[model samples]
Target: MHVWPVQDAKARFSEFLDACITEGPQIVSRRGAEEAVLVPIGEWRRLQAAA
Candidate 1:
């Protein structure tokens, strides 16, 4: 996984999507703290089902 600041993620949304698909989950942060994650649909479904 890789960390991306909120500003950079917003500016490079296309690249962010590409990285999420090809490089597993991508982490997003706000003010240097973890904010969210972008995960592939398959993985999301698996997590949902598990839960």
Candidate 2:
């Protein structure tokens, strides 16, 4: 998985989105700590539904 700092993730949101859509999900970190992930909408919806 690819991980990005929050600052970089915010600055390159478009690219990160592209990666999530094409290459798969991406992990976002805050100050070197993992914060969240960028995932495809479909996947997110499916996960939500399952949960």
Candidate 3:
């Protein structure tokens, strides 16, 4: 998994989105804390349905 700093993830969102779509998932960190993850829509929907 690739980890992206909050600023870098925001500045390069398009690339981040592309990576999440093709590379599966990308981690986003804020001030070194794990803030969130970017996953493909399909994956998100599946996860939601399973919840």
| Highest TM-score against the true fold, candidate | 1
**Which lDDT tens digits does candidate 2 get at residues 1-51?**
599998888899899889999998899998798888888999999999999
Encode model 3's per-residue lDDT on 1-51: one tens digit a residue: 599999999999999999999898899999898889988999999999999
TM-score of every model?
A: 0.92, 0.84, 0.86
Which is better, 1 or 2, measured by lDDT?
A: 1
Name the regions of candidate 3 deviating beyond 4 angstroms.
none
**TM-score-best of 1 and 3:** 1
Tell me the tens digit of each residue's lDDT in model 1 across 8-38: 9999999999999998999999999989999
Task: Tell me how candidate 1 scores on lDDT.
Answer: 0.95
- Candidate 2 vs candidate 3: which has greater TM-score? 3
Query: Positional deviation of 44 in candidate 2, in angstroms?
Result: 1.0
True-structure RMSD, every candidate: 0.7, 1.1, 1.0
Model 2 spans with C-alpha error above 4 angstroms: none
In Å, residue 31's CA in model 2 sits off its true spot by: 1.3
Pairs of residues clashing in candidate 1: none
Best by lDDT: 1
Give per-residue lDDT, candidate 1, residue 25: 98
